[PDB]
Design a protein around this nucleic acid. Sequence first.
DNA 1: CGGGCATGCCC
DNA 2: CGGGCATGCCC
Lengths: 194, 194
Amino acid sequence: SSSVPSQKTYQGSYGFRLGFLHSKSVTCTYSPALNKMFCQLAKTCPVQLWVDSTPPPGTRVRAMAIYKQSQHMTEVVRRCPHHERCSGLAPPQHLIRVEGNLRVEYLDDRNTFRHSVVVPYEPPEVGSDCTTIHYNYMCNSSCMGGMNRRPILTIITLEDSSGNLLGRNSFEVRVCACPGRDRRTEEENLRKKG
Amino acid sequence: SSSVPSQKTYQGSYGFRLGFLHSKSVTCTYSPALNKMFCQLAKTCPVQLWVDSTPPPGTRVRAMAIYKQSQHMTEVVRRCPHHERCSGLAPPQHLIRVEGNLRVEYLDDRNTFRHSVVVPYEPPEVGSDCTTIHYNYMCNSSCMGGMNRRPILTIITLEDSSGNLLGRNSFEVRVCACPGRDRRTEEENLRKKG
DNA sequence: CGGGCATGCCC
DNA sequence: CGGGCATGCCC
Ligand SMILES: *C[C@@H]1C(=O)C2CCN1CC2
Ligand SMILES: *C[C@@H]1C(=O)C2CCN1CC2
Ligand SMILES: *C[C@@H]1C(=O)C2CCN1CC2
Ligand SMILES: *C[C@@H]1C(=O)C2CCN1CC2
Ligand SMILES: *C[C@H]1C(=O)C2CCN1CC2
Ligand SMILES: *C[C@H]1C(=O)C2CCN1CC2
Ligand SMILES: [Zn+2]
Ligand SMILES: [Zn+2]
């Protein structure tokens, strides 16, 4: 009955976890202490999928944004009117895109109105321990009429072809002009005032 | 042949001049030194019309915004996509509105695509030396996808019913959250660095 | 590139 | 209300 998707971590029977590459001026950088990705708008944000056990054929990987703060959780995260107007398969209203994938699907939920982007799950290549997806966030966190400075979480779910939830993980995202500066600022704030 | 309207002051045979009331946190304030109005979005910005001689019946008062800097003069000044979407008679794309007037006309030029807003000229009441029009600016100067931090001029023209230009005056506008702060900052910059 | 201005807003 | 943070950007 809820229109707010769960953000509860569920690593599940397949041992599903997210991973991030190690990285002022940088195009993205991930803070383990904050569980937070800092990245630039319309630029590659790699996310690694790690599993202990192999998902069944036909498993799908869904990404969805939700506002982090309780006061905004019920509002659908959308692209701002400016970036919606300056717009391949991604509807211009969608914040999150996937690049480099020929089987991407963009979904608008008939009941909750929430946007999500889905690609097939593929196991890592021989010798690799993870699968990397290239996400793109098409607005800054600050965009007026869109996220409007409100932090979001990205929720990544592993789902089988039948719709069973196999795993769920989430990370906070700040899309900003200066990821390196802002990560250092927030980590210092955590140490000094958190 | 030009699509850029003239901004040249032409006080003309009727002795046409603009006037402004004397005024942090203030909703508007005019700087004589800068010939610049500082005002808040969607709030009253009174402009006084002064003439030495009485215009003929059917005279009209037109207001139009142009970008002040040479690099942007040829671009039409428009409302940003966010404020256009969150919108009486004024088309949502128009930056400048007039409130309190039952004969307001909003014009989109067929050839130059520029927006303007027009009201009839009315002489001052007995004992008064000027006529006041209440303008509203529907975006901040900073609005992304609109003025985008670029200064504008407002051009006020007195035109007879036949289309003759009787007078022209202009003033710079900064639409901003804190007119009093920003006026003091710019006037200090003028004294120290201008 | 990094230093520092910008400017709506602080929940 | 004013002090000062915010955060894309400096032409
Ligand atoms: C955004 C990511 C990173 O974390 C670094 C810098 C750019 N990409 C790949 C490596
Ligand atoms: C998660 C794995 C690794 O450890 C490296 C970088 C990303 N994938 C493939 C090789
Ligand atoms: C915006 C104008 C002014 O200059 C002062 C303050 C509010 N209005 C009327 C007087
Ligand atoms: C321009 C005139 C004045 O001097 C005062 C204020 C505005 N109008 C009417 C009275
Ligand atoms: C973040 C900051 C930088 O380091 C360069 C890119 C964006 N911004 C301006 C220059
Ligand atoms: C300009 C500044 C003020 O003085 C109040 C109104 C807008 N802004 C925040 C509070
Ligand atoms: Zn945006
Ligand atoms: Zn606007």
